[PDB]
Amino acid sequence: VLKKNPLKNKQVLLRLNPYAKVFAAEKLGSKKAEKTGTKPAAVFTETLKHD
Amino acid sequence: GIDHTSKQHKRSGHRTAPKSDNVYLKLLVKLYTFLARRTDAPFNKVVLKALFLSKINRPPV
Amino acid sequence: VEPVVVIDGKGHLVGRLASVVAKQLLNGQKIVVVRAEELNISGEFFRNKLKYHDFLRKATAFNKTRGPFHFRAPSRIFYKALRGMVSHKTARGKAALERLKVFEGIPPPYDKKKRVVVPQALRVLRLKPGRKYTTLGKLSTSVGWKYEDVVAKLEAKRKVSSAEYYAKKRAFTKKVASANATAAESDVAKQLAALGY
Amino acid sequence: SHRKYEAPRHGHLGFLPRKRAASIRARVKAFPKDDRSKPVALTSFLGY
Amino acid sequence: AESHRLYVKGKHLSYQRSKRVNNPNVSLIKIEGVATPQDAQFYLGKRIAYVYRASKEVRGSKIRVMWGKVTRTHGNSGVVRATFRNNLPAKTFGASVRIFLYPSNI
Amino acid sequence: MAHFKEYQVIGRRLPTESVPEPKLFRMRIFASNEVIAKSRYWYFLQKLHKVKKASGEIVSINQINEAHPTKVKNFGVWVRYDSRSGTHNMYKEIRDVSRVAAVETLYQDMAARHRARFRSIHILKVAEIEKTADVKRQYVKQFLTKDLKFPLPHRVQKSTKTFSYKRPSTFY
Amino acid sequence: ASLPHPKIVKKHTKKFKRHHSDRYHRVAENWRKQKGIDSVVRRRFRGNISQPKIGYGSNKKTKFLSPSGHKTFLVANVKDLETLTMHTKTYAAEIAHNISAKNRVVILARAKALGIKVTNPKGRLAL
Amino acid sequence: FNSSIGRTAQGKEFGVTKARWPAKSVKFVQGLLQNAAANAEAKGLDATKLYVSHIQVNQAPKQRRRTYRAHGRINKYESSPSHIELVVTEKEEAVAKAAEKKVVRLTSRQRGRIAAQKRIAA
Amino acid sequence: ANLFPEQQNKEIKAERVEDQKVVDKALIAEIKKTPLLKQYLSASFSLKNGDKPHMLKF
RNA sequence: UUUGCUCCACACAAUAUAGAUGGAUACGAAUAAGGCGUCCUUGUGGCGUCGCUGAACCAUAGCAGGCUAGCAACGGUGCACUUGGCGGAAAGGCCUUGGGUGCUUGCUGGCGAAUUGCAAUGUCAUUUUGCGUGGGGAUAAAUCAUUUGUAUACGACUUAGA
RNA sequence: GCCCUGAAAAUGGAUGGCGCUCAAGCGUGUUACCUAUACUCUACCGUCAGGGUUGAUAUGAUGCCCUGACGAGUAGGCAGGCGUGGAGGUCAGUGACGAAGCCUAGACCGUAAGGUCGGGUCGAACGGCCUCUAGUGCAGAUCUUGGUGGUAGUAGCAAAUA
RNA sequence: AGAACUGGCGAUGCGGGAUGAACCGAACGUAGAGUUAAGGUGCCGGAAUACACGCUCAUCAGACACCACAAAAGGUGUUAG
């Protein structure tokens, strides 16, 4: 009778996509990334910094 | 504001009951609305719908 | 924040002023303008003269009487340029105009009491240093006002009577200032010093 | 359509309105420019 | 001792409106001192009360009251929309009103 | 417009059977975001080679941040603006802290001195003119002297309140 | 005694008077839609008598309910009255205007010992 | 009923400018008053304290008559009559008061203040 | 509603009164530790002409 | 006209509010310049200082502010007198001398407050008038009617009449 | 580019007005802000549509209930309702202890047509429901008949000597 | 005056264009809250006497579509080129 949406109601948010229990504790949406910091070619930079 | 694709509030066009006040004929109908809503048989649906037809759609067989 | 905001007129620019003074009335705030002949207007003298002359020829045909009355008194000018800035035809507008009082020079009541100023209207806080402005009293006189002299005479009187009051206040301020100088350095004055005073 | 034959208007407008003056004694709207140097003399009078 | 104001001086300006259609269901008050929508927020909720004097005395007073409450900021000069159990008179545009400090959040 | 961003967008027609790996074209575009950047890209591109969004693709679209975002520099400019009359070429100079802001000052100077909307404006030769004396306009040649200095006459202290009690000074 | 009735709203309380029912005394206050081609009230302008739309219909939950959550039912004589012996909480007995001052008192006497709410318990109650 | 009527000085004591002297209207009124004063005597009242309380004169059935206007048209010549009626009352003194006591309905915090007030003083 | 207003005849509970001091003393002994706090408390509140509760601090 | 009329101090009823709820807190002139202090040889001077808002200054603690005890100062100060002066631009206000009288939160005490029950403006301003107090003061005219003609359609105007 | 000139018409006069001159102008870019019967959520009405539901020792399955959408509208079409005269039936209906009618800035119901009640007035019939029936609903028609205004105590009642 | 396509108006209110059948926005059950469109935010009037770059001085300024008209031709006025 009432369209209680998720996003601002953790109770319904779990009544659909039960993965929001695991997503919570795991954090996930904020989980860090790997610093596989490589290097961009010398060409890339001289063409990006052209006149 | 809505760009109606279709003509709003179409009264369907089909009959929902016999235009007559034939008490007995109205009983058969209440008998068949039931059958056509519980038996599930396609037969009752046609027979029910068939009671609502005027004398020009109930030709003398 | 006070019941009456006596507003000094000198330097102010008609329109700008007229507007804030008009919003303060339609807000309940009571107001009284003073020195309306020291009131300035944008544009040079000759322009503001033609503009009054192009309004001076605007009267009702069949009866120059029931026509648009052309007031020459600086107070009434600034006022007509404030009327158009209020719904004076409604009771509310009629009412707001009864909170307003525009005076030439500075009459007896509004002289013993402090008059303020509106920065957002003032000439020397607007007009790009260089543009030619116009003094009201000057224009008005050249369009019917016949009391230019009478005021210059009275304010001259008041300015000297006031200058004498401030001279007493000049030494009286320095008087208490000198007592406040030695009262400082004391244990009760240094207590407030840390308490932001 | 114009007047046809321009002719001086009848009457002086600066003498309006032609209403019955308030009092029988014509008020003296203005008196001579004051001369602070002469004897203190009178400026008008009341005749018949 | 001489002052006892536990509220703030607000002025009832005009009703929420357009160029030619005012909606009396909502008013607009210019609170004393407030001038920004950020610092206006601290007044939201604060039950408002327009106090006026009547001739005929009711349950026991000749000074009846109109209750309201700030509902939201409005504009950029610290004005706030207010609603009352019964919308305001209109004869009160330029009438000093009272903004209390409750419900208090501090 | 907003705060520009000198985007770098390269396109290269589209890999056709006969001509695979087509000569890429790099355009140093200006705009307030990326889509305006791309649009403006074909816009100029199709005004050089028979190539438009339908026949081509957007290789890469990387932004281009200023070299020394705190190094006040002189700028040289060449603009191909279409005035109401027809179209003209010109060279203005805007000494500022970056290409992006100097071009922002330019565009609004194009709207003030020659009423030309961003739409009737093509930005040609735009680079930082190295040494002075290379400054062809005196209005820039001005702020280029031995340890300059100047006052700010008539300060106009903007008021917060409606009324004052202290009639305003303009000393600085 | 009235069954728990939801807050009775009305949406529009001001009666719908014919347009100009004030201008001319001939034009009765009785509502009538303006069929006119130029009629401003029909064209529905900004500031003219709001016409009776169906949208002003009342909550079927509170339609016919008088201020005391009771639907009023006209009562002729006592025989007619006892139709409410089993609905003292839903209806209110309304004595008709053609009921004698003597008969009314008999009806009230019956309606009181039955627990019915007579809406007009003052009709011809001359002391 | 005074449009185009003449002006007169005698109408100053009332505050108007228009005032006529309806000799007939008066003779029928003072003539009828004569009758009122006489009814008061046979009813036994004070000929002094007597004053007119209610005097109402309204339209009567217009006496019909005709007049001939040019081109042989017949325009009416109505005779608007009256229906005067009045009441001479004995003038009584003391308007009196006979005011209502007024049942006060003050709230508990409205009594409290009255209680706390008459608690510091009398 | 039959006396209105015939004073009290209902004032206070000797209990409630004594219970005050039972606590009053406890805090009173706490207030004479912080200077002027007794004065600050025997003092009422009020907003001054040029007092802003939003840009204020308590 | 039986004592009507008016001014003051009140007293109580009526009365309304374009809207008190700490204080409208007085140079002038300038603004590509000023204020303030101060110095001399007094100037369109020298020197110091300040501004960047009133976000100031004043007021402000006490049953809307009570009852008492003082301490220290003799200041501040409210009301009502009083002295002298100033102000006519709408002066109707500002300044002053001296008594009086209440308070003083500049410092320290002691009592009081509750039940308005967990908020309900929670009533404290000033406007007008009326009816009753007793206390001063003052004893007219206008209009109509008559009259005139410098006036006039009528009103109006202008004269005259104990 | 801005600006000046080129730029002459009749009642006084219109960037809408006032007024605006580092604008409240012209150009531009940035924000925040404002408010339509539109958009979003919700409540209520109605229409439409899709379904549910005999169910027992109860009362409407042209019933109750759930569900979704939509609502402008002259000419016009249809459907559902309100009202009036009279007809068959019905309430063993109302009534001289006051019917009908009329009055009522008195109350209630209905979106509405209208219905209902109190008070007043009044004096002899009348109403609800089920059907039947029609000379069945008025603001116009330079409508008919009758009646009454403003006009207006106005025009004017002035030839024939008095 | 007469055609084409489309949209309107007619028949359609509403908010803006001061004002207006046709333009901008937008289509109407009755309410509430929110958010906007169009258009605007000195005062009239709800909304910044907001921000920034500039240009402009007119003894006949200029002021935002339909829209309430202005030109060819001139200016050592000034700005930029």
Side-chain angles (χ1 to χ4, degrees), chain C residues 16 19 47 85 92:
Chain C
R16 303 291 179 179
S19 172
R47 293 198 58 63
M85 260 182 248
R92 173 163 167 282

mmCIF file with all atom_site columns, all heavy atoms in Angstrom, chain C residues 16 19 47 85 92, chain L residues 42-43 49 59 61:
data_model
loop_
_atom_site.group_PDB
_atom_site.id
_atom_site.type_symbol
_atom_site.label_atom_id
_atom_site.label_alt_id
_atom_site.label_comp_id
_atom_site.label_asym_id
_atom_site.label_entity_id
_atom_site.label_seq_id
_atom_site.pdbx_PDB_ins_code
_atom_site.Cartn_x
_atom_site.Cartn_y
_atom_site.Cartn_z
_atom_site.occupancy
_atom_site.B_iso_or_equiv
_atom_site.pdbx_formal_charge
_atom_site.auth_seq_id
_atom_site.auth_comp_id
_atom_site.auth_asym_id
_atom_site.auth_atom_id
_atom_site.pdbx_PDB_model_num
ATOM 1   N N     . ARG C 1 16 ? 18.530 55.382 -5.926  1.00 0.00 ? 16 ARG C N     1
ATOM 2   C CA    . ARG C 1 16 ? 19.113 54.426 -4.975  1.00 0.00 ? 16 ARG C CA    1
ATOM 3   C C     . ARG C 1 16 ? 18.434 54.605 -3.593  1.00 0.00 ? 16 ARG C C     1
ATOM 4   O O     . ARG C 1 16 ? 17.833 53.670 -3.047  1.00 0.00 ? 16 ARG C O     1
ATOM 5   C CB    . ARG C 1 16 ? 20.627 54.676 -4.833  1.00 0.00 ? 16 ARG C CB    1
ATOM 6   C CG    . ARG C 1 16 ? 21.428 54.603 -6.132  1.00 0.00 ? 16 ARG C CG    1
ATOM 7   C CD    . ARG C 1 16 ? 21.485 53.177 -6.686  1.00 0.00 ? 16 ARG C CD    1
ATOM 8   N NE    . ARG C 1 16 ? 22.228 53.095 -7.950  1.00 0.00 ? 16 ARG C NE    1
ATOM 9   C CZ    . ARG C 1 16 ? 22.445 51.969 -8.631  1.00 0.00 ? 16 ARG C CZ    1
ATOM 10  N NH1   . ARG C 1 16 ? 21.977 50.808 -8.176  1.00 0.00 ? 16 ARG C NH1   1
ATOM 11  N NH2   . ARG C 1 16 ? 23.131 52.001 -9.769  1.00 0.00 ? 16 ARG C NH2   1
ATOM 12  N N     . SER C 1 19 ? 14.651 53.960 -3.289  1.00 0.00 ? 19 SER C N     1
ATOM 13  C CA    . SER C 1 19 ? 14.394 52.518 -3.238  1.00 0.00 ? 19 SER C CA    1
ATOM 14  C C     . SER C 1 19 ? 14.507 51.939 -1.789  1.00 0.00 ? 19 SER C C     1
ATOM 15  O O     . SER C 1 19 ? 13.517 51.419 -1.268  1.00 0.00 ? 19 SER C O     1
ATOM 16  C CB    . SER C 1 19 ? 15.349 51.760 -4.158  1.00 0.00 ? 19 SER C CB    1
ATOM 17  O OG    . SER C 1 19 ? 15.205 50.362 -3.966  1.00 0.00 ? 19 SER C OG    1
ATOM 18  N N     . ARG C 1 47 ? 21.038 68.007 -17.778 1.00 0.00 ? 47 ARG C N     1
ATOM 19  C CA    . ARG C 1 47 ? 20.209 66.839 -18.121 1.00 0.00 ? 47 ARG C CA    1
ATOM 20  C C     . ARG C 1 47 ? 19.017 66.708 -17.134 1.00 0.00 ? 47 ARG C C     1
ATOM 21  O O     . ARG C 1 47 ? 17.866 66.554 -17.548 1.00 0.00 ? 47 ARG C O     1
ATOM 22  C CB    . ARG C 1 47 ? 21.016 65.537 -18.056 1.00 0.00 ? 47 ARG C CB    1
ATOM 23  C CG    . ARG C 1 47 ? 22.115 65.389 -19.105 1.00 0.00 ? 47 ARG C CG    1
ATOM 24  C CD    . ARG C 1 47 ? 22.518 63.911 -19.227 1.00 0.00 ? 47 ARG C CD    1
ATOM 25  N NE    . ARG C 1 47 ? 21.372 63.057 -19.582 1.00 0.00 ? 47 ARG C NE    1
ATOM 26  C CZ    . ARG C 1 47 ? 20.676 63.138 -20.720 1.00 0.00 ? 47 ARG C CZ    1
ATOM 27  N NH1   . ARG C 1 47 ? 20.984 64.042 -21.654 1.00 0.00 ? 47 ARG C NH1   1
ATOM 28  N NH2   . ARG C 1 47 ? 19.665 62.299 -20.925 1.00 0.00 ? 47 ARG C NH2   1
ATOM 29  N N     . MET C 1 85 ? 7.516  54.394 -6.448  1.00 0.00 ? 85 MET C N     1
ATOM 30  C CA    . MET C 1 85 ? 8.183  53.200 -5.912  1.00 0.00 ? 85 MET C CA    1
ATOM 31  C C     . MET C 1 85 ? 7.406  52.583 -4.707  1.00 0.00 ? 85 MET C C     1
ATOM 32  O O     . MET C 1 85 ? 7.998  51.959 -3.819  1.00 0.00 ? 85 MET C O     1
ATOM 33  C CB    . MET C 1 85 ? 9.619  53.541 -5.498  1.00 0.00 ? 85 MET C CB    1
ATOM 34  C CG    . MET C 1 85 ? 10.660 53.113 -6.527  1.00 0.00 ? 85 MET C CG    1
ATOM 35  S SD    . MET C 1 85 ? 12.399 53.458 -6.062  1.00 0.00 ? 85 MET C SD    1
ATOM 36  C CE    . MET C 1 85 ? 12.820 54.739 -7.279  1.00 0.00 ? 85 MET C CE    1
ATOM 37  N N     . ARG C 1 92 ? -2.359 49.894 2.042   1.00 0.00 ? 92 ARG C N     1
ATOM 38  C CA    . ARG C 1 92 ? -1.002 49.550 2.488   1.00 0.00 ? 92 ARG C CA    1
ATOM 39  C C     . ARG C 1 92 ? 0.008  50.661 2.020   1.00 0.00 ? 92 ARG C C     1
ATOM 40  O O     . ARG C 1 92 ? 0.805  51.162 2.822   1.00 0.00 ? 92 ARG C O     1
ATOM 41  C CB    . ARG C 1 92 ? -0.607 48.177 1.927   1.00 0.00 ? 92 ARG C CB    1
ATOM 42  C CG    . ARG C 1 92 ? 0.849  47.771 2.186   1.00 0.00 ? 92 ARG C CG    1
ATOM 43  C CD    . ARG C 1 92 ? 1.029  46.257 1.976   1.00 0.00 ? 92 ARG C CD    1
ATOM 44  N NE    . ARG C 1 92 ? 2.433  45.841 1.908   1.00 0.00 ? 92 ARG C NE    1
ATOM 45  C CZ    . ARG C 1 92 ? 3.222  45.990 0.844   1.00 0.00 ? 92 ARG C CZ    1
ATOM 46  N NH1   . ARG C 1 92 ? 2.765  46.556 -0.270  1.00 0.00 ? 92 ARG C NH1   1
ATOM 47  N NH2   . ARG C 1 92 ? 4.473  45.545 0.895   1.00 0.00 ? 92 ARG C NH2   1
ATOM 48  P P     . G   L 2 42 ? 16.849 43.538 -9.319  1.00 0.00 ? 42 G   L P     1
ATOM 49  O OP1   . G   L 2 42 ? 16.168 43.937 -10.599 1.00 0.00 ? 42 G   L OP1   1
ATOM 50  O OP2   . G   L 2 42 ? 18.275 43.078 -9.353  1.00 0.00 ? 42 G   L OP2   1
ATOM 51  O "O5'" . G   L 2 42 ? 16.743 44.755 -8.296  1.00 0.00 ? 42 G   L "O5'" 1
ATOM 52  C "C5'" . G   L 2 42 ? 17.546 44.781 -7.096  1.00 0.00 ? 42 G   L "C5'" 1
ATOM 53  C "C4'" . G   L 2 42 ? 17.518 46.163 -6.490  1.00 0.00 ? 42 G   L "C4'" 1
ATOM 54  O "O4'" . G   L 2 42 ? 17.965 47.119 -7.489  1.00 0.00 ? 42 G   L "O4'" 1
ATOM 55  C "C3'" . G   L 2 42 ? 16.137 46.631 -6.039  1.00 0.00 ? 42 G   L "C3'" 1
ATOM 56  O "O3'" . G   L 2 42 ? 15.939 46.280 -4.656  1.00 0.00 ? 42 G   L "O3'" 1
ATOM 57  C "C2'" . G   L 2 42 ? 16.213 48.143 -6.238  1.00 0.00 ? 42 G   L "C2'" 1
ATOM 58  O "O2'" . G   L 2 42 ? 16.849 48.776 -5.143  1.00 0.00 ? 42 G   L "O2'" 1
ATOM 59  C "C1'" . G   L 2 42 ? 17.117 48.253 -7.478  1.00 0.00 ? 42 G   L "C1'" 1
ATOM 60  N N9    . G   L 2 42 ? 16.460 48.338 -8.785  1.00 0.00 ? 42 G   L N9    1
ATOM 61  C C8    . G   L 2 42 ? 16.756 47.589 -9.906  1.00 0.00 ? 42 G   L C8    1
ATOM 62  N N7    . G   L 2 42 ? 16.051 47.926 -10.955 1.00 0.00 ? 42 G   L N7    1
ATOM 63  C C5    . G   L 2 42 ? 15.231 48.951 -10.501 1.00 0.00 ? 42 G   L C5    1
ATOM 64  C C6    . G   L 2 42 ? 14.253 49.722 -11.193 1.00 0.00 ? 42 G   L C6    1
ATOM 65  O O6    . G   L 2 42 ? 13.930 49.669 -12.394 1.00 0.00 ? 42 G   L O6    1
ATOM 66  N N1    . G   L 2 42 ? 13.632 50.634 -10.340 1.00 0.00 ? 42 G   L N1    1
ATOM 67  C C2    . G   L 2 42 ? 13.917 50.787 -8.996  1.00 0.00 ? 42 G   L C2    1
ATOM 68  N N2    . G   L 2 42 ? 13.194 51.693 -8.328  1.00 0.00 ? 42 G   L N2    1
ATOM 69  N N3    . G   L 2 42 ? 14.840 50.095 -8.353  1.00 0.00 ? 42 G   L N3    1
ATOM 70  C C4    . G   L 2 42 ? 15.453 49.202 -9.157  1.00 0.00 ? 42 G   L C4    1
ATOM 71  P P     . C   L 2 43 ? 14.669 45.386 -4.212  1.00 0.00 ? 43 C   L P     1
ATOM 72  O OP1   . C   L 2 43 ? 14.888 44.912 -2.803  1.00 0.00 ? 43 C   L OP1   1
ATOM 73  O OP2   . C   L 2 43 ? 14.383 44.385 -5.287  1.00 0.00 ? 43 C   L OP2   1
ATOM 74  O "O5'" . C   L 2 43 ? 13.472 46.431 -4.206  1.00 0.00 ? 43 C   L "O5'" 1
ATOM 75  C "C5'" . C   L 2 43 ? 13.444 47.506 -3.266  1.00 0.00 ? 43 C   L "C5'" 1
ATOM 76  C "C4'" . C   L 2 43 ? 12.353 48.472 -3.633  1.00 0.00 ? 43 C   L "C4'" 1
ATOM 77  O "O4'" . C   L 2 43 ? 12.764 49.283 -4.770  1.00 0.00 ? 43 C   L "O4'" 1
ATOM 78  C "C3'" . C   L 2 43 ? 11.057 47.835 -4.098  1.00 0.00 ? 43 C   L "C3'" 1
ATOM 79  O "O3'" . C   L 2 43 ? 10.259 47.343 -3.035  1.00 0.00 ? 43 C   L "O3'" 1
ATOM 80  C "C2'" . C   L 2 43 ? 10.407 48.977 -4.864  1.00 0.00 ? 43 C   L "C2'" 1
ATOM 81  O "O2'" . C   L 2 43 ? 9.790  49.931 -4.014  1.00 0.00 ? 43 C   L "O2'" 1
ATOM 82  C "C1'" . C   L 2 43 ? 11.625 49.590 -5.568  1.00 0.00 ? 43 C   L "C1'" 1
ATOM 83  N N1    . C   L 2 43 ? 11.824 49.029 -6.919  1.00 0.00 ? 43 C   L N1    1
ATOM 84  C C2    . C   L 2 43 ? 11.002 49.473 -7.971  1.00 0.00 ? 43 C   L C2    1
ATOM 85  O O2    . C   L 2 43 ? 10.147 50.347 -7.744  1.00 0.00 ? 43 C   L O2    1
ATOM 86  N N3    . C   L 2 43 ? 11.160 48.937 -9.204  1.00 0.00 ? 43 C   L N3    1
ATOM 87  C C4    . C   L 2 43 ? 12.093 48.001 -9.413  1.00 0.00 ? 43 C   L C4    1
ATOM 88  N N4    . C   L 2 43 ? 12.214 47.492 -10.652 1.00 0.00 ? 43 C   L N4    1
ATOM 89  C C5    . C   L 2 43 ? 12.947 47.542 -8.366  1.00 0.00 ? 43 C   L C5    1
ATOM 90  C C6    . C   L 2 43 ? 12.781 48.080 -7.150  1.00 0.00 ? 43 C   L C6    1
ATOM 91  P P     . U   L 2 49 ? 18.772 42.411 -3.421  1.00 0.00 ? 49 U   L P     1
ATOM 92  O OP1   . U   L 2 49 ? 18.205 42.793 -2.077  1.00 0.00 ? 49 U   L OP1   1
ATOM 93  O OP2   . U   L 2 49 ? 17.845 41.985 -4.517  1.00 0.00 ? 49 U   L OP2   1
ATOM 94  O "O5'" . U   L 2 49 ? 19.637 43.635 -3.971  1.00 0.00 ? 49 U   L "O5'" 1
ATOM 95  C "C5'" . U   L 2 49 ? 20.731 44.178 -3.207  1.00 0.00 ? 49 U   L "C5'" 1
ATOM 96  C "C4'" . U   L 2 49 ? 21.787 44.720 -4.141  1.00 0.00 ? 49 U   L "C4'" 1
ATOM 97  O "O4'" . U   L 2 49 ? 21.210 45.788 -4.956  1.00 0.00 ? 49 U   L "O4'" 1
ATOM 98  C "C3'" . U   L 2 49 ? 23.013 45.322 -3.454  1.00 0.00 ? 49 U   L "C3'" 1
ATOM 99  O "O3'" . U   L 2 49 ? 24.181 45.065 -4.233  1.00 0.00 ? 49 U   L "O3'" 1
ATOM 100 C "C2'" . U   L 2 49 ? 22.708 46.821 -3.453  1.00 0.00 ? 49 U   L "C2'" 1
ATOM 101 O "O2'" . U   L 2 49 ? 23.872 47.636 -3.426  1.00 0.00 ? 49 U   L "O2'" 1
ATOM 102 C "C1'" . U   L 2 49 ? 21.959 46.983 -4.779  1.00 0.00 ? 49 U   L "C1'" 1
ATOM 103 N N1    . U   L 2 49 ? 21.033 48.131 -4.814  1.00 0.00 ? 49 U   L N1    1
ATOM 104 C C2    . U   L 2 49 ? 20.682 48.637 -6.063  1.00 0.00 ? 49 U   L C2    1
ATOM 105 O O2    . U   L 2 49 ? 21.071 48.149 -7.119  1.00 0.00 ? 49 U   L O2    1
ATOM 106 N N3    . U   L 2 49 ? 19.847 49.729 -6.027  1.00 0.00 ? 49 U   L N3    1
ATOM 107 C C4    . U   L 2 49 ? 19.325 50.353 -4.902  1.00 0.00 ? 49 U   L C4    1
ATOM 108 O O4    . U   L 2 49 ? 18.564 51.317 -5.044  1.00 0.00 ? 49 U   L O4    1
ATOM 109 C C5    . U   L 2 49 ? 19.717 49.762 -3.648  1.00 0.00 ? 49 U   L C5    1
ATOM 110 C C6    . U   L 2 49 ? 20.532 48.702 -3.645  1.00 0.00 ? 49 U   L C6    1
ATOM 111 P P     . U   L 2 59 ? 24.478 65.848 -22.773 1.00 0.00 ? 59 U   L P     1
ATOM 112 O OP1   . U   L 2 59 ? 25.886 66.214 -23.149 1.00 0.00 ? 59 U   L OP1   1
ATOM 113 O OP2   . U   L 2 59 ? 24.204 65.269 -21.420 1.00 0.00 ? 59 U   L OP2   1
ATOM 114 O "O5'" . U   L 2 59 ? 23.581 67.159 -22.969 1.00 0.00 ? 59 U   L "O5'" 1
ATOM 115 C "C5'" . U   L 2 59 ? 22.131 67.076 -22.994 1.00 0.00 ? 59 U   L "C5'" 1
ATOM 116 C "C4'" . U   L 2 59 ? 21.529 68.275 -23.715 1.00 0.00 ? 59 U   L "C4'" 1
ATOM 117 O "O4'" . U   L 2 59 ? 21.801 69.489 -22.952 1.00 0.00 ? 59 U   L "O4'" 1
ATOM 118 C "C3'" . U   L 2 59 ? 21.998 68.550 -25.146 1.00 0.00 ? 59 U   L "C3'" 1
ATOM 119 O "O3'" . U   L 2 59 ? 20.885 69.068 -25.908 1.00 0.00 ? 59 U   L "O3'" 1
ATOM 120 C "C2'" . U   L 2 59 ? 23.101 69.601 -24.925 1.00 0.00 ? 59 U   L "C2'" 1
ATOM 121 O "O2'" . U   L 2 59 ? 23.358 70.426 -26.051 1.00 0.00 ? 59 U   L "O2'" 1
ATOM 122 C "C1'" . U   L 2 59 ? 22.527 70.409 -23.753 1.00 0.00 ? 59 U   L "C1'" 1
ATOM 123 N N1    . U   L 2 59 ? 23.505 71.102 -22.888 1.00 0.00 ? 59 U   L N1    1
ATOM 124 C C2    . U   L 2 59 ? 23.634 72.478 -23.035 1.00 0.00 ? 59 U   L C2    1
ATOM 125 O O2    . U   L 2 59 ? 23.021 73.116 -23.878 1.00 0.00 ? 59 U   L O2    1
ATOM 126 N N3    . U   L 2 59 ? 24.513 73.081 -22.158 1.00 0.00 ? 59 U   L N3    1
ATOM 127 C C4    . U   L 2 59 ? 25.273 72.469 -21.172 1.00 0.00 ? 59 U   L C4    1
ATOM 128 O O4    . U   L 2 59 ? 25.997 73.161 -20.439 1.00 0.00 ? 59 U   L O4    1
ATOM 129 C C5    . U   L 2 59 ? 25.108 71.039 -21.099 1.00 0.00 ? 59 U   L C5    1
ATOM 130 C C6    . U   L 2 59 ? 24.255 70.421 -21.940 1.00 0.00 ? 59 U   L C6    1
ATOM 131 P P     . A   L 2 61 ? 18.461 62.378 -24.444 1.00 0.00 ? 61 A   L P     1
ATOM 132 O OP1   . A   L 2 61 ? 17.171 61.746 -23.975 1.00 0.00 ? 61 A   L OP1   1
ATOM 133 O OP2   . A   L 2 61 ? 19.096 63.455 -23.619 1.00 0.00 ? 61 A   L OP2   1
ATOM 134 O "O5'" . A   L 2 61 ? 19.549 61.231 -24.671 1.00 0.00 ? 61 A   L "O5'" 1
ATOM 135 C "C5'" . A   L 2 61 ? 19.160 59.885 -25.035 1.00 0.00 ? 61 A   L "C5'" 1
ATOM 136 C "C4'" . A   L 2 61 ? 20.375 58.993 -25.100 1.00 0.00 ? 61 A   L "C4'" 1
ATOM 137 O "O4'" . A   L 2 61 ? 21.093 59.069 -23.846 1.00 0.00 ? 61 A   L "O4'" 1
ATOM 138 C "C3'" . A   L 2 61 ? 20.051 57.520 -25.271 1.00 0.00 ? 61 A   L "C3'" 1
ATOM 139 O "O3'" . A   L 2 61 ? 19.859 57.217 -26.652 1.00 0.00 ? 61 A   L "O3'" 1
ATOM 140 C "C2'" . A   L 2 61 ? 21.260 56.821 -24.654 1.00 0.00 ? 61 A   L "C2'" 1
ATOM 141 O "O2'" . A   L 2 61 ? 22.368 56.712 -25.527 1.00 0.00 ? 61 A   L "O2'" 1
ATOM 142 C "C1'" . A   L 2 61 ? 21.619 57.789 -23.522 1.00 0.00 ? 61 A   L "C1'" 1
ATOM 143 N N9    . A   L 2 61 ? 21.184 57.425 -22.164 1.00 0.00 ? 61 A   L N9    1
ATOM 144 C C8    . A   L 2 61 ? 20.139 57.933 -21.406 1.00 0.00 ? 61 A   L C8    1
ATOM 145 N N7    . A   L 2 61 ? 20.093 57.450 -20.181 1.00 0.00 ? 61 A   L N7    1
ATOM 146 C C5    . A   L 2 61 ? 21.158 56.552 -20.134 1.00 0.00 ? 61 A   L C5    1
ATOM 147 C C6    . A   L 2 61 ? 21.671 55.724 -19.104 1.00 0.00 ? 61 A   L C6    1
ATOM 148 N N6    . A   L 2 61 ? 21.171 55.678 -17.862 1.00 0.00 ? 61 A   L N6    1
ATOM 149 N N1    . A   L 2 61 ? 22.738 54.944 -19.397 1.00 0.00 ? 61 A   L N1    1
ATOM 150 C C2    . A   L 2 61 ? 23.257 55.000 -20.629 1.00 0.00 ? 61 A   L C2    1
ATOM 151 N N3    . A   L 2 61 ? 22.881 55.739 -21.671 1.00 0.00 ? 61 A   L N3    1
ATOM 152 C C4    . A   L 2 61 ? 21.817 56.503 -21.355 1.00 0.00 ? 61 A   L C4    1
#
